[PDB]
Amino acid sequence: LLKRDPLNSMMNIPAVLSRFAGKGLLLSENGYLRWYVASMSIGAVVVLALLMVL
């Protein structure tokens, strides 16, 4: 039951999570200038709202 070293796999889990998160984040780098402007305006909205709620 232990021959595959389960503790090593459970400690290897954060590497899998990092690879999945990086692959998911790289989808936003689609190369569209209009989406880049849209993301700038979205970030402006988020920053302004965060500054207003404190």
Ligand X SMILES: CCCCCCCCCCCCCCCCCC(=O)OC[C@H](COP(=O)(O)OCCN)OC(=O)CCCCCCCCCCCCCCCCC
Site for ligand X in 11-30 (CB under 6 A): 11-12, 14-15, 18-19
| Residue 10 binding partner per list another protein, ligand X, none, with a CB distance cut-off of 5 to 8 Å that depends on partner kind | none
Residue 32: left (phi > 0), alpha (psi -120 to 50), or beta?
Answer: beta
Determine the size of the site formed for another protein (CB under 8 A). Answer: 33
- At residue 9, φ and ψ (nearest 5 deg) are -65, -40
After which residues do gaps appear in the chain, with C to N over 2.5 Å? none
Binding site for ligand X (CB under 6 A): 11-12, 14-15, 18-19
Binding site for another protein (CB under 8 A): 18-19, 21-23, 25-26, 28-52, 54
